[PDB]
Symmetry: C3
Subunit: 399 residues, 3 copies
């Protein structure tokens, strides 16, 4: 069929894909549009990228639904370790597989911009665009990669439904993936590492599914940033280095069955009246020393809650930071800060820390329940408007 | 190798795949069987479907193990939204990618029937058939799509082992996926929406794995129906619109780490003595208005339990239905109905509701434990044969 | 591009891949090395294996980063059932899809050895090698398959980063997958069954991700074995027959949202000071009779803990073993054995058993908390140094 393209064998290209794969892909998209010319004759296409090192000089603009861009794998290599190592005898020093080196010279910072102008009720949304099994690489960057090199991998900037980002590698980018106005996006089985931020769901979103990923962005950005997100599902991910899942006015999220690790506070922040979110069956680990930052102090919380009726159940909170490195100096670090809101619920969580640490209930909070989720020594309730059923501990009395 | 076929380039096809891809696939299957003729020379084949709009007029019948049918993506477009919109200027109005329009003219309702004749002990089960990354579309349908247009995407009707349905799109079908007599089926990473039912595991099943899907079927059918299911695993799914997971004599299921939402009751129903099932670390949301139905009233439960020794832990039950729309009128809605059974266990669940709502223990139940899973006001126990450790209030 | 190879069509092959696919893949790798000759010109390659039956006689050695070897599916057929059946009329008797019959005659046990010698700081690690959607088969084996036929599917024996094993089938091997010194491996969506052991992470590992697999190895080995593992994530798996997840000096693991079943003790063993590991939202089922062993007796535990500060929350422990088969004879079997360690935490778990069964706290343990995770009758505390908040009875 004429809907199958390979960037290296398609003869209609006027530049080599090794020189500018962005120009080649744009030319393929123009070819698709010349063949798929009515609303009932636009099934889309597949563009295959074989293993190779490809420079991208021109931003790709996708306004075609059902476009699949696929390669041979995620191609990750730790450029951060490379850049701290003596690499003269390394067998390879670049990420690989189907490897796009993001090198725009066109005044734009995105390798891929997925965007259609118009009112969605009038022109239709972008639907079921698929990025699978290729590598996007910013080539050179320094920690924490934000602002860094300013480069973005994939950015969706118009309303979209059922998009799919699967099996990819993203490395050395300021922003790996940005999706504005996402409805039911599927972000799964990716390897995002050594980037400023990993996933940003901007504007608003409905029922995003973020599953089975490695998310390894650093401490200036977010692993998952979600603005006005309804119904987010975040599960089965390994989120490392500077795990930071921030919801701003997000509700009815399900954040379950993840491995979550940071060298910094704010592993989950439910901000700006984020309510009825579940945080269940996750392992949280806070450590120190893989980078340092004062973006947050240790009173911010491993989990920070500003909202109502959230549920924190069945998790482990494991904290190991040397006392001399805790901030503000001399203070007890915070495991969960319930900063504001009503009827939040913590139950059946185990808190293990190298120094005394606290669940803090701000004086403004109401009806918070803390049920086998803190010993007496682990609760710092700044209002009497809470219910405590303590995790058992000894020495209630002094004599 | 000659085991790789593309429906648009295979020279043996006597019909265009755009006109009837079902006939083309059946011709390929006949070719495979002509070349793979003994029990040690049947490795199977791959059929690739490039992006395109393909009509299916003839049901495909598969009795070949290790057949992979694969395309370029799930291809979903909301035909429900399209059908309530003014679409003259829409850039596209059809689902796409590798897009099969299910339009049988042969009197059958399935696009794909996977079925082998004979006793499995004598002829073997069907093994490791793979459907990946294509779109099955019923073309025209009206809510709630059941009975709807009567169309079925894929139906497995004989005993099978290790089948795999991955990365697919299904839309505007009465039944997206039906698997009878499945052992270790893998149903993962799919997008099933605007269908009557999404997944039906019929007859019986053993250790089915249903993970990482979007399931968005409507209120007359089931998101997941499984009868005589041993060991079902359901995790990592986003199940929306009319989430309804019904187990009929299902035991030892693990239903965990899902996002579950419905505009109707019966988000999970453990029916016909379904026992020793785990429901843990799920977010449940009940809302109202995206369709209406009287199939269940609000006393049925967001979770409904008829069975023994089930375990409900670490979930949120979030309920928001205007009082004037609650049924029966004026009555307190039910979060969990323990309808019958012994030694069921509810612990460490948070119930948040816009009106007073209850966990109801039917008078026939025995030894139910409700442990930090309901305040006193949230328990309506109709038998003293239970144990309550109240969520404080 | 010349970085794409098919073992059945590549013109450089001097051996048939059906006779020795190992030789053909080794020849492809030599070709890759001849074309990709500097540290900035080694993007790797893809090797496609179409459906077919291929013997492997020569071990493949991979020391090239970013090599993908991919086929048409997992190809599983239950050879165990075949070998106890009358198969004269079976339509197929062999696993299929892209099917490698592991038949080494070169003095080695592995089909694939992934190894780069010499110091990772000097030569680099092996990075992002991908095995996808093919079948590795030991051809003939007898239960429990370990030591069995001695055959290994894939063995990584040098430090590696971001490797990926996805969608594969492994059957009738002593060891399906071994990875030594793994950093962020991704082992996902596989079907590993009727093998001695399924996944072994040796030496040490960091942040392995094991998700969405069927793991069906038998009772002499391990479903998942990990030594010196930091941060292992195990979730969404269906682990059957002889589920045994053993961590030796493993810490900060997250073992959640799995369906876990064994006919034997030791479904999870946290051994040799394994600490701060989470076991949450899993369904555990212990049954008897699908094979028998005296490797462990029933006092070992469904879960066995030797370490500190672990967390066991929101699970079901379902135990069904006839009293006549429980060992030591006449003794109550153990659900969770806290063998040694400090500050372990059990909360909101439901224990259901056909006979009296216990959480046992060894006399050496300190500060164990057991909170709505055992009735009084289900706790056998052999030290007064614990906290009990009983499940009501
Ligand atoms: O548009 C076609 C069709 O899509 C449907 C499918 O259900 O969804 C609409 C869609 O776009 C909505 C859009 O604006 C939503 C908006 O509100 C959010 O944020 C508010 C707080 O400010 C919340 O109170 C509110 O509940 C949320 O919806 O987002 C803006 C920023 O907040 C608000 O000004 C809007 O009212 O979302 C994007 C990103 O903001 C905008 O471009 C859209 O107008 O929803 C998804 C994104 O979630 C998108 O794919 C859809 O087009 C249906 O409603 C429409 O008929
Ligand atoms: O970290 C930078 C630097 O700023 C300070 C002072 O702003 O702390 C900021 C930080 O922690 C503040 C903390 O307590 C704030 C406190 O006061 C709030 O409430 C009062 C009314 O009850 C108001 O008068 C006041 O304006 C508000 O800030 O909250 C407690 C009552 O709940 C009071 O005892 C405190 O004075 O916030 C939490 C409680 O929410 C405490 O644990 C903290 O001490 O802000 C973030 C948390 O949001 C944390 O990371 C920062 O330390 C100074 O303390 C720091 O050196
Ligand atoms: O250091 C920067 C930063 O990078 C991270 C990212 O994960 O680590 C990458 C790094 O890991 C080392 C590596 O090998 C460690 C090795 O030895 C360990 O285990 C032994 C047995 O317990 C101990 O004797 C030894 O002390 C431990 O370090 O693990 C292999 C198996 O034992 C041995 O062959 C290795 O020497 O860790 C993984 C395995 O867990 C391997 O893939 C790695 O090589 O890798 C680079 C290159 O080697 C090295 O600089 C880093 O430590 C993170 O941990 C750090 O914060
Ligand atoms: O081959 C089976 C055969 O071996 C025996 C020998 O006892 O059991 C081994 C087995 O269970 C042992 C079990 O109890 C051990 C016990 O003693 C330990 O602690 C004492 C100090 O407190 C030491 O004097 C003694 O040497 C240590 O072994 O532990 C209890 C105190 O915690 C004592 O009452 C017991 O005598 O281990 C657990 C407790 O950890 C009990 O439930 C068991 O009875 O070892 C594994 C468990 O690690 C289990 O599978 C085996 O049965 C004999 O009992 C069997 O016939
Ligand atoms: O394993 C994937 C690779 O991701 C890492 C994780 O650790 C980081 C980021 O990428 O590496 C730098 C080393 O400078 C650390 O600061 C940061 O954690 C690689 O380390 C790892 O090998
Ligand atoms: O009439 C619109 C119908 O479509 C819905 C909502 O939209 C879908 C499918 O069914 O579901 C998600 C919403 O997030 C979208 O991907 C997809 O279009 C029904 O809920 C609604 O009745
Ligand atoms: O499925 C509906 C379609 O199927 C047919 O009955 C046979 O192909 C068409 O006449 C009709 O439009």
């Amino acid at each position: 069929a004429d809907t199958v393209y390979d960037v290296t064998t398609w003869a209609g290209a006027t530049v080599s894909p090794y020189v500018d794969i962005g120009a080649v892909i744009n030319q393929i998209i123009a070819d698709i549009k010349s063949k798929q010319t009515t609303q009932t004759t636009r099934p889309g296409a597949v563009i295959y990228i074989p293993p190779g090192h490809y420079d991208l000089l021109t931003r790709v603009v996708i306004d075609v639904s059902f476009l699949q861009i696929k390669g041979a794998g995620h191609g990750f290599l730790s450029e951060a370790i490379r850049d701290e190592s003596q690499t003269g005898s390394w067998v390879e020093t670049l990420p690989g597989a189907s490897h796009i080196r993001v090198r725009n010279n066109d005044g734009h910072n995105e390798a891929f911009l997925v965007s259609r102008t118009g009112a969605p009720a009038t022109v239709g949304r972008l639907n079921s665009i698929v990025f699978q099994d290729f590598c996007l690489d910013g080539v050179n960057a320094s920690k924490p990669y934000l602002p860094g090199n300013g480069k973005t991998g994939i950015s969706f900037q118009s309303d979209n439904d059922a998009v799919r980002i699967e099996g990819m590698g993203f490395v050395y980018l300021a922003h790996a993936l940005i999706i504005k106005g996402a409805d039911a996006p599927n972000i799964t089985n990716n390897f995002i590492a050594e980037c400023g931020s990993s996933i940003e769901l901007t504007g608003a979103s409905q029922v995003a599914k973020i599953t089975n990923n490695f998310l390894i962005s650093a401490w200036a950005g977010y692993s998952i940033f979600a603005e006005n997100a309804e119904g987010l599902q975040i599960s089965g991910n390994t989120i490392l280095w500077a795990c930071n899942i921030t919801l701003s006015s997000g509700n009815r999220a399900s954040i379950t069955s993840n491995k979550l690790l940071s060298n910094f506070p704010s592993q989950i922040a439910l901000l700006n009246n984020s309510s009825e979110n579940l945080i269940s069956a996750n392992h949280f680990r806070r450590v120190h020393g893989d980078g340092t930052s004062t973006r947050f102090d240790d009173k911010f919380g491993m989990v920070h809650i500003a909202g109502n009726k959230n549920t924190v159940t069945g998790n482990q909170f494991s904290f190991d930071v040397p006392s001399q490195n805790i901030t503000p100096a001399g203070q007890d670090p915070t495991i969960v800060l319930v900063k504001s809101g009503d009827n939040n619920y913590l139950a059946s969580n185990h808190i293990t820390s190298n120094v005394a640490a606290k669940v803090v209930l701000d004086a403004s909070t109401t009806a918070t329940r803390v049920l086998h989720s803190a010993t007496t020594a682990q609760l710092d309730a700044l209002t009497t408007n809470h219910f405590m059923v303590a995790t058992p501990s000894h020495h209630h009395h002094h004599h």
